[PDB]
Amino acid sequence: AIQTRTVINQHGVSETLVENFLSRAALVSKRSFEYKKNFFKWTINTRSFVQLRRKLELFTYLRFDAEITILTTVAVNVGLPDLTLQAMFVPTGALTPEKQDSFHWQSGSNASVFFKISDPPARITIPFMCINSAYSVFYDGFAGFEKNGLYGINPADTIGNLCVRIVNEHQPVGFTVTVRVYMKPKHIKAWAPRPPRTLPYMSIANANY
Amino acid sequence: AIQTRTVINQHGVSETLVENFLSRAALVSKRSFEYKKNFFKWTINTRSFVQLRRKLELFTYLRFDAEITILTTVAVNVGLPDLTLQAMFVPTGALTPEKQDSFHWQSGSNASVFFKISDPPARITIPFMCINSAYSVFYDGFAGFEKNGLYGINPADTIGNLCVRIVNEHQPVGFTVTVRVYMKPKHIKAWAPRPPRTLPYMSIANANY
Amino acid sequence: PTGALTPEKQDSFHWQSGSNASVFFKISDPPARITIPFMCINSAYSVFYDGFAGFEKNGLYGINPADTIGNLCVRIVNEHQPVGFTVTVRVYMKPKHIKAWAPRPPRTLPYMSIANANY
Amino acid sequence: GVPTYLLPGSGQFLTTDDHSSAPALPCFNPTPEMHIPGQVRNMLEVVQVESMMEINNTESAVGMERLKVDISALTDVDQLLFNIPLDIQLDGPLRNTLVGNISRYYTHWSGSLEMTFMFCGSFMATGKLILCYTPPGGSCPTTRETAMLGTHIVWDFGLQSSVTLIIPWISGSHYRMFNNDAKSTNANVGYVTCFMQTNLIVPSESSDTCSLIGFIAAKDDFSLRLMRDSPDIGQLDHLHAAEAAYQ
Amino acid sequence: GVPTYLLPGSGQFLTTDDHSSAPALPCFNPTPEMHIPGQVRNMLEVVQVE
Amino acid sequence: GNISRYYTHWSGSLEMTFMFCGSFMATGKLILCYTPPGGSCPTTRETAMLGTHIVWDFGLQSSVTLIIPWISGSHYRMFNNDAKSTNANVGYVTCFMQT
Amino acid sequence: GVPTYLLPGSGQFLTTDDHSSAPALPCFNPTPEMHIPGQVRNMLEVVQVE
Amino acid sequence: LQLKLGNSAIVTQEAANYCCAYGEWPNYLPDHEAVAIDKPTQPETATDRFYTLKSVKWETGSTGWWWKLPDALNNIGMFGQNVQHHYLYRSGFLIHVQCNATKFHQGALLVVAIPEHQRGAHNTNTSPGFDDIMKGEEGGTFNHPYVLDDGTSLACATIFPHQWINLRTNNSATIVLPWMNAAPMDFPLRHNQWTLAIIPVVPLGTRTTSSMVPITVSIAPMCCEFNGLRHAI
């Protein structure tokens, strides 16, 4: 426990701006699947890891873009022949595939990328797809009207989900695929600051303690 | 022992400038690790090899940038499937990972690169991150105040450390990784020249003889 | 170049020397390429030198000490692997920015050595 | 889009190239500059500073007794005191100076020098010396009479206590000219030698031993080229904590 | 065409870089902005509150 | 102290404000010292009056304002291993009962 | 960034091409030129001698 | 021929020159409101007094002396009291070294001032302790002066600001030292910027035995300032 000092001279103000307070491309999903549920489905919620959930709940309303980067690292359970993947983005109102060889992967209307393993990782940016003017982080209301609706789910707030599939046919080798997704918020406009949370989180759906 | 001569005509002065006296990208680290301590951690001190330590101690204060280039050469202990690496740069105040699968590799705040083996080698440049105005090469003081502090360690002088990890899952083959780091100082401004050292070095911490 | 030491073993400490220039190229890339400036300390390369470097009575005839350039050294970087392989190196040199002086008659009889003009 | 094709020499890594790089931390402001006194911009501002040499080139002179020569009262006339072989790269009086350590990193050097002596006797003591300069052709003179016909000055002690001797021109290289690893030493350019003209004259109260100190400094046309690495320390030895960083 | 060559550091992925990206849905108009009161632009407007 | 956890280096001036929540009739005095970062915390009232003090009562005002001139800080991970070096204690603001 | 695509004939090595190259030693000044007498510029100045 | 600085005055010197170390004077902190913004008290009339140290003895077998300049004045006088109850200072110095011998002595000194002189222990793997560095007013002694106790040679030690005391010609030296540090203000109890060191190159001699030839060192802080101890509220 050595107690030191150093004088500090600074001039910068433009480092605490909200535009470059949240532009850091944190990890948001990490899930494996074995191919021999044979695919990766993930809703595009942001409150999955508590390092970025607490930082994002200082504000009430904010507005941004997505900038998804999918990084796939394969293995054989020695060399793998030229694997090709598909990463289809399914918004609301379009149906999600339930099986690997479904007819929903052939749907033209929703956007899809086709990237090899040997390439640099895939990258698409997703526009602001709320039907309000901003994402309500905290919603003090009920989607379900009558007496039984889940508290604090805004029906206008949802984005979609993305689905990742090995394109190739059944091969005599069986391999394990690990998918990591990095999201980088762009063009931030944040409103109405709020006090930060001290007690630890208990669920993904609500603010219990 | 043949003694020869040749007349010499020169005009150049701009070869002994300090800007291109230290811009030569010398090797600063070389350490292997086997994956089957499973990673590479190295503090960003510069006095590790005595070819570049003596050349850097002609001056008292200097100021530069880093320009790190990481060159990784793998082997299997015949062909290796598509290895992906991560090289996270951990400054002061942020925590360093102690195990390969720690939760500190998922930290968004510190910068990381993701490079394959088959690519050209990775490269990031690091700004001047002292909190004085220059790096004190020779420090005539104590960080520890009371009676027991290590002599000549400036608490404002430190930079950080970088950590290199195989991203992939446990595979049935076990391989040996060798990492080389090349640092190239850019934008030199050096002050107060000092006489060069003749007797050989004895330790990495101090100037004994 | 001249004045810097040449490595005598594969894992010598002269490969880690920062001062001399080095390239690091894979096999799968297109081949490596560097250009080397005019590093004589006269104003031109003496092809034919009518003199002695060694002064006294025993110097090799026709070796100009100002004429030399250097030497290049090529090494497999990787560790000892359980497979042993054979490497073949070819070097192609392409002279640029020629300025030639004083033409001479061409040689008819065949060469006998690499050091001198015998016949 | 634009149509491209790759050259040979694509994706390599020279250690001497100059290209831009991706910043690891954008939107980071470093600490601003401050006027710290004594900035050096060129390494020819270091070699122009005077720095003393080792005149006492005899064996078994251990310590800081190498920096001075004694001239006792019981010394016969015309006896040579010292000579300096003007060689930077070779072991002698000019090996461990300030001009002989910066010009180890470079290969070719050519310029003019400037030597300065200084006498450290008592105030009463007198006498004369003589200081010759031999051009790079001829060899070192042995007697005083054969050395007077060169370029000499006759310096005494009572009037001045410091002299200045301009060396006109030197040059050098390293000359690795053969097939194998051989070394060809450059030929010995110049000498500066000193003889005793008259005897030393001290009174009955001062001590009978005096001393000389020599300095050296390059002039403003000393040039250097083709940087290499210096062998001055030694390759590598045992460092006590050689892996502080790893653990 | 134009002659190129690749630098070292080609095809990596920094988590702090800033480059353009292929839009997943072109020809899509988001909902327009509205004056929502209380916009914060700099985080030194938060620390000055008692 | 929650926004300046996300950042490493901080340096600036502060502003403290007290407020008294007694009844309307009640009176009395206090005294409010500020210790610069060199010296240590005072223990008695007389050794604390010689510093920088104000003598605040209750009947006239119910709020006071005390400008703190300058602070600074960092984290200082200076060794080889994972160690923590706490910054030295800058300043104190202490309060004694006058009457 | 700018969008590219590779032609056929990309990454080969003709022995007669003319392109720039990475200098092995930048910041190095060669020895300057000197008027050495008898410069030949074209090889039709050699065949005209008896 | 006197140096009247404030309260005291070293009178009756030999002719001398203010060879400024490098090219600058103290300068008084031209503009830094970004750091330690309690304006420096800047005492000027009650610190500048030529604190003369103890006279040291120069014999034939002597080998050298060294003082750490913010350390040699921590317990002496009005500058010594301002080091306690202040933690930031900023000052440059002035040094006047004067020995005195007759016209029958012979010798030579090298008065050099070394910025950031990190010392080193001989033939061990342990860094020097707190007690081998913070010696105080008495100073120290070179154990191996030929390598300046850190390996860098004495033959190249004229790259620092220096003057010669040659007892044939003169017996006085004067160096003015500016603020040489990376930070704008520094901590006086644990960091020492300069290091005054005097080394006899040619040892003395006379017909009789061991004449003392006592030397005097005098130090005076030039343009000093400290943090603010008095604030409004």
Side-chain angles (χ1 to χ4, degrees):
Chain A
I2 288 172
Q3 294 178 355
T4 56
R5 292 179 185 272
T6 304
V7 295
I8 297 170
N9 47 357
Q10 296 174 357
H11 295 288
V13 184
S14 68
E15 190 166 356
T16 62
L17 294 173
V18 185
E19 179 70 28
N20 55 5
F21 185 77
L22 298 166
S23 292
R24 192 47 68 96
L27 199 151
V28 291
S29 175
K30 187 255 182 63
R31 181 67 175 171
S32 176
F33 65 97
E34 292 182 355
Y35 178 74
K36 184 181 286 291
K37 182 63 72 176
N38 300 117
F39 65 99
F40 167 76
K41 184 177 74 68
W42 176 67
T43 314
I44 315 297
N45 58 356
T46 188
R47 57 183 187 273
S48 181
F49 286 167
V50 301
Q51 293 291 320
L52 184 276
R53 180 179 176 178
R54 183 185 188 271
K55 188 174 183 178
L56 204 41
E57 288 181 353
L58 274 75
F59 306 100
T60 304
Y61 302 102
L62 76 161
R63 178 170 181 168
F64 57 90
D65 297 335
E67 190 76 27
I68 301 298
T69 300
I70 300 167
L71 195 148
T72 298
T73 61
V74 296
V76 174
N77 195 0
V78 181
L80 50 93
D82 293 328
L83 294 178
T84 308
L85 275 73
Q86 181 180 4
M88 181 176 67
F89 175 69
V90 182
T92 60
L95 278 76
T96 59
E98 72 272 15
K99 192 176 173 65
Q100 180 177 359
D101 54 353
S102 295
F103 294 98
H104 297 93
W105 295 98
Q106 298 178 359
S107 178
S109 298
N110 50 6
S112 298
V113 301
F114 285 93
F115 61 96
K116 270 74 67 181
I117 297 297
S118 299
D119 285 332
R123 180 188 289 268
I124 51 173
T125 179
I126 299 167
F128 175 70
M129 292 192 298
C130 178
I131 65 175
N132 290 321
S133 298
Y135 292 111
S136 294
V137 175
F138 291 100
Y139 183 74
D140 193 2
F142 293 94
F145 183 76
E146 58 280 14
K147 294 290 178 67
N148 191 2
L150 291 176
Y151 179 72
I153 292 175
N154 193 1
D157 200 6
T158 179
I159 301 172
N161 47 3
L162 56 86
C163 297
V164 177
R165 177 177 69 97
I166 299 296
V167 178
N168 289 321
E169 196 182 0
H170 184 198
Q171 293 183 355
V173 291
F175 48 86
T176 301
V177 178
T178 302
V179 180
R180 293 177 177 89
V181 175
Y182 291 93
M183 184 179 76
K184 187 254 184 64
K186 291 173 69 176
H187 298 287
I188 309 294
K189 290 175 70 67
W191 291 273
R194 295 197 65 173
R197 179 161 180 167
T198 59
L199 270 73
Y201 291 97
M202 191 175 286
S203 297
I204 203 169
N206 52 3
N208 285 321
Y209 60 94
Chain B
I2 288 172
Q3 294 178 355
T4 56
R5 292 179 185 272
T6 304
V7 295
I8 297 170
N9 47 357
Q10 296 174 357
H11 295 288
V13 184
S14 68
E15 190 166 356
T16 62
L17 294 173
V18 185
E19 179 70 28
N20 55 5
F21 185 77
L22 298 166
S23 292
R24 192 47 68 96
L27 199 151
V28 291
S29 175
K30 187 255 182 63
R31 181 67 175 171
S32 176
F33 65 97
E34 292 182 355
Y35 178 74
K36 184 181 286 291
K37 182 63 72 176
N38 300 117
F39 65 99
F40 167 76
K41 184 177 74 68
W42 176 67
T43 314
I44 315 297
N45 58 356
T46 188
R47 57 183 187 273
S48 181
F49 286 167
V50 301
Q51 293 291 320
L52 184 276
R53 180 179 176 178
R54 183 185 188 271
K55 188 174 183 178
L56 204 41
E57 288 181 353
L58 274 75
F59 306 100
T60 304
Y61 302 102
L62 76 161
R63 178 170 181 168
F64 57 90
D65 297 335
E67 190 76 27
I68 301 298
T69 300
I70 300 167
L71 195 148
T72 298
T73 61
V74 296
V76 174
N77 195 0
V78 181
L80 50 93
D82 293 328
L83 294 178
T84 308
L85 275 73
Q86 181 180 4
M88 181 176 67
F89 175 69
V90 182
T92 60
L95 278 76
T96 59
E98 72 272 15
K99 192 176 173 65
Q100 180 177 359
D101 54 353
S102 295
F103 294 98
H104 297 93
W105 295 98
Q106 298 178 359
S107 178
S109 298
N110 50 6
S112 298
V113 301
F114 285 93
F115 61 96
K116 270 74 67 181
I117 297 297
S118 299
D119 285 332
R123 180 188 289 268
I124 51 173
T125 179
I126 299 167
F128 175 70
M129 292 192 298
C130 178
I131 65 175
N132 290 321
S133 298
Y135 292 111
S136 294
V137 175
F138 291 100
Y139 183 74
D140 193 2
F142 293 94
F145 183 76
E146 58 280 14
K147 294 290 178 67
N148 191 3
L150 291 176
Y151 179 72
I153 292 175
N154 193 1
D157 200 6
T158 179
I159 301 172
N161 47 3
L162 56 86
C163 297
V164 177
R165 177 177 69 97
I166 299 296
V167 178
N168 289 321
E169 196 182 0
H170 184 198
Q171 293 183 355
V173 291
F175 48 86
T176 301
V177 178
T178 302
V179 180
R180 293 177 177 89
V181 175
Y182 291 93
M183 184 179 76
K184 187 254 184 64
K186 291 173 69 176
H187 297 287
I188 309 294
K189 290 175 70 67
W191 291 273
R194 295 197 65 173
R197 179 161 180 167
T198 59
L199 270 73
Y201 291 97
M202 191 175 286
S203 297
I204 203 169
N206 52 3
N208 285 321
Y209 60 94
Chain C
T2 60
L5 278 76
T6 59
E8 72 272 15
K9 192 176 173 65
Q10 180 177 359
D11 54 353
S12 295
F13 294 98
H14 297 93
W15 295 98
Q16 298 178 359
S17 178
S19 298
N20 50 6
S22 298
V23 301
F24 285 93
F25 61 96
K26 270 74 67 181
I27 297 297
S28 299
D29 285 332
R33 180 188 289 268
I34 51 173
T35 179
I36 299 167
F38 175 70
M39 292 192 298
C40 178
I41 65 175
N42 290 321
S43 298
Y45 292 111
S46 294
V47 175
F48 291 100
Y49 183 74
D50 193 2
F52 293 94
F55 183 76
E56 58 280 14
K57 294 290 178 67
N58 191 3
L60 291 176
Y61 179 72
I63 292 175
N64 193 1
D67 200 6
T68 179
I69 301 172
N71 47 3
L72 56 86
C73 297
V74 177
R75 177 177 69 97
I76 299 296
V77 178
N78 289 321
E79 196 182 0
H80 184 198
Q81 293 183 355
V83 291
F85 48 86
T86 301
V87 178
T88 302
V89 180
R90 293 177 177 89
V91 175
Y92 291 93
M93 184 179 76
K94 187 254 184 64
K96 291 173 69 176
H97 298 287
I98 309 294
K99 290 175 70 67
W101 291 273
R104 295 197 65 173
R107 179 161 180 167
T108 59
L109 270 73
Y111 291 97
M112 191 175 286
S113 297
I114 203 169
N116 52 3
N118 285 321
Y119 60 94
Chain D
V2 294
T4 65
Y5 63 96
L6 300 177
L7 276 76
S10 176
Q12 62 178 353
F13 170 66
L14 278 82
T15 69
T16 61
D17 58 352
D18 192 3
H19 294 292
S20 66
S21 299
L25 296 172
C27 298
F28 177 74
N29 295 115
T31 59
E33 298 183 353
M34 196 186 79
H35 185 273
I36 299 169
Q39 184 178 3
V40 61
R41 293 179 180 90
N42 197 357
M43 297 300 289
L44 275 44
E45 298 179 357
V46 178
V47 302
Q48 296 177 1
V49 180
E50 64 182 2
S51 63
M52 68 185 77
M53 67 180 77
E54 295 178 353
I55 301 295
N56 198 358
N57 52 6
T58 186
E59 70 180 3
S60 179
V62 177
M64 64 188 297
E65 296 175 354
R66 296 180 65 86
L67 302 176
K68 58 186 286 293
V69 284
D70 290 333
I71 41 174
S72 48
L74 313 198
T75 59
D76 197 77
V77 305
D78 314 351
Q79 186 173 355
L80 188 147
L81 295 177
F82 55 88
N83 54 355
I84 290 98
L86 297 176
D87 288 332
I88 289 171
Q89 74 275 16
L90 292 174
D91 196 1
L94 302 183
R95 178 180 64 84
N96 193 1
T97 57
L98 197 37
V99 72
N101 285 317
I102 305 300
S103 67
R104 299 288 175 84
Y105 293 102
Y106 293 96
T107 299
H108 303 95
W109 60 87
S110 71
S112 62
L113 270 64
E114 188 268 335
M115 290 178 65
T116 300
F117 293 95
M118 187 178 74
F119 184 75
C120 296
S122 64
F123 183 72
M124 290 288 109
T126 57
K128 289 188 283 294
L129 288 173
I130 183 168
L131 291 169
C132 302
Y133 173 69
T134 300
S139 181
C140 55
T142 62
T143 62
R144 185 188 63 84
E145 182 66 31
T146 62
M148 186 183 73
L149 278 318
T151 304
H152 69 274
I153 60 173
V154 179
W155 173 50
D156 61 353
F157 296 154
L159 194 285
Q160 282 185 356
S161 298
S162 296
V163 80
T164 303
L165 187 67
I166 303 295
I167 303 301
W169 185 258
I170 66 165
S171 65
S173 179
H174 285 86
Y175 302 113
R176 190 264 309 279
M177 70 185 76
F178 292 104
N179 192 5
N180 50 1
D181 193 2
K183 294 180 182 179
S184 297
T185 306
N186 192 2
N188 195 357
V189 63
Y191 290 97
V192 173
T193 180
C194 179
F195 294 92
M196 184 68 78
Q197 174 62 254
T198 67
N199 198 1
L200 189 71
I201 296 168
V202 293
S204 298
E205 186 68 29
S206 295
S207 180
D208 55 351
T209 301
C210 295
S211 295
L212 291 170
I213 297 171
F215 294 147
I216 196 165
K219 295 292 288 183
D220 54 354
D221 55 353
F222 191 78
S223 178
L224 293 166
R225 196 174 70 189
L226 192 64
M227 186 176 74
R228 67 181 181 93
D229 49 353
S230 176
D232 197 4
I233 291 298
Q235 295 178 357
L236 285 89
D237 286 328
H238 185 199
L239 297 176
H240 183 268
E243 65 172 280
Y246 309 107
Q247 296 178 356
Chain E
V2 294
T4 65
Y5 63 96
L6 300 177
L7 276 76
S10 176
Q12 62 178 353
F13 170 66
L14 278 82
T15 69
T16 61
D17 58 352
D18 192 3
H19 294 292
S20 66
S21 299
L25 296 172
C27 298
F28 177 74
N29 295 115
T31 59
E33 298 183 353
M34 196 186 79
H35 185 273
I36 299 169
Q39 184 178 3
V40 61
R41 293 179 180 90
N42 197 357
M43 297 300 289
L44 275 44
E45 298 179 357
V46 178
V47 302
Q48 296 177 1
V49 180
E50 64 182 2
Chain F
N2 285 317
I3 305 300
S4 67
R5 299 288 175 84
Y6 293 102
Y7 293 96
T8 299
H9 303 95
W10 60 87
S11 71
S13 62
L14 270 64
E15 188 268 335
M16 290 178 65
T17 300
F18 293 95
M19 187 178 74
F20 184 75
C21 296
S23 64
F24 183 72
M25 290 288 109
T27 57
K29 289 188 283 294
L30 288 173
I31 183 168
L32 291 169
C33 302
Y34 173 69
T35 300
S40 181
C41 55
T43 62
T44 62
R45 185 188 63 84
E46 182 66 31
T47 62
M49 186 183 73
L50 278 318
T52 304
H53 69 274
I54 60 173
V55 179
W56 173 50
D57 61 353
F58 296 154
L60 194 285
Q61 282 185 356
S62 298
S63 296
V64 80
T65 303
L66 187 67
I67 303 295
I68 303 301
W70 185 258
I71 66 165
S72 65
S74 179
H75 285 86
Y76 302 113
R77 190 264 309 279
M78 70 185 76
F79 292 104
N80 192 5
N81 50 1
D82 193 2
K84 294 180 182 179
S85 297
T86 306
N87 192 2
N89 195 357
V90 63
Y92 290 97
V93 173
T94 180
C95 179
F96 294 92
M97 184 68 78
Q98 174 62 254
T99 67
Chain G
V2 294
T4 65
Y5 63 96
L6 300 177
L7 276 76
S10 176
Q12 62 178 353
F13 170 66
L14 278 82
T15 69
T16 61
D17 58 352
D18 192 3
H19 294 292
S20 66
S21 299
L25 296 172
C27 298
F28 177 74
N29 295 115
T31 59
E33 298 183 353
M34 196 186 79
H35 185 273
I36 299 169
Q39 184 178 3
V40 61
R41 293 179 180 90
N42 197 357
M43 297 300 289
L44 275 44
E45 298 179 357
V46 178
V47 302
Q48 296 177 1
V49 180
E50 64 182 2
Chain H
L1 278 175
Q2 67 182 358
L3 282 46
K4 184 174 76 71
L5 185 58
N7 195 2
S8 73
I10 296 171
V11 300
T12 68
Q13 68 183 1
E14 184 178 2
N17 63 347
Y18 290 164
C19 63
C20 317
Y22 302 113
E24 310 110 18
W25 286 62
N27 198 25
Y28 263 114
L29 184 89
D31 179 76
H32 295 286
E33 74 272 14
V35 64
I37 191 66
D38 166 332
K39 293 179 179 179
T41 305
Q42 54 184 355
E44 186 178 359
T45 185
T47 309
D48 309 341
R49 181 177 65 83
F50 283 109
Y51 299 101
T52 64
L53 298 177
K54 187 69 67 66
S55 298
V56 300
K57 205 177 176 172
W58 180 13
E59 306 178 15
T60 298
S62 292
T63 182
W65 297 275
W66 57 268
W67 291 271
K68 303 284 187 178
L69 282 176
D71 195 9
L73 297 175
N74 283 323
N75 202 2
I76 295 171
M78 295 74 168
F79 186 80
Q81 291 179 357
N82 286 319
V83 168
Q84 289 87 21
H85 65 274
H86 289 276
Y87 69 99
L88 295 178
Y89 82 107
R90 183 185 192 274
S91 65
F93 296 96
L94 187 148
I95 297 172
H96 182 76
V97 175
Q98 181 175 2
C99 66
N100 47 359
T102 59
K103 295 181 177 68
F104 297 104
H105 292 92
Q106 57 97 27
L109 291 175
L110 177 66
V111 181
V112 69
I114 302 168
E116 295 289 335
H117 180 68
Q118 183 177 359
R119 293 180 60 85
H122 176 71
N123 198 359
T124 190
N125 288 317
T126 302
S127 65
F130 185 78
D131 293 329
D132 294 332
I133 305 301
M134 299 295 171
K135 301 294 286 185
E137 182 184 0
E138 292 181 352
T141 298
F142 287 109
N143 292 318
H144 298 281
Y146 183 73
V147 296
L148 287 177
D149 293 337
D150 51 353
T152 65
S153 296
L154 188 145
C156 301
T158 64
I159 188 67
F160 298 119
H162 70 284
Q163 285 190 357
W164 289 91
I165 297 173
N166 190 3
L167 284 175
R168 185 173 183 174
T169 298
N170 54 358
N171 56 359
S172 180
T174 303
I175 305 100
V176 177
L177 299 175
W179 176 247
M180 187 72 206
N181 197 2
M185 298 177 78
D186 202 5
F187 300 95
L189 288 173
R190 70 183 185 179
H191 191 196
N192 301 320
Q193 294 90 20
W194 295 96
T195 300
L196 178 66
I198 55 175
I199 299 165
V201 175
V202 174
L204 61 84
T206 183
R207 179 65 66 191
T208 182
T209 197
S210 290
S211 305
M212 37 171 258
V213 190
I215 304 172
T216 295
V217 183
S218 299
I219 305 165
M222 183 61 71
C223 295
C224 62
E225 69 184 4
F226 295 94
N227 58 350
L229 207 48
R230 279 80 178 271
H231 186 74
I233 54 174

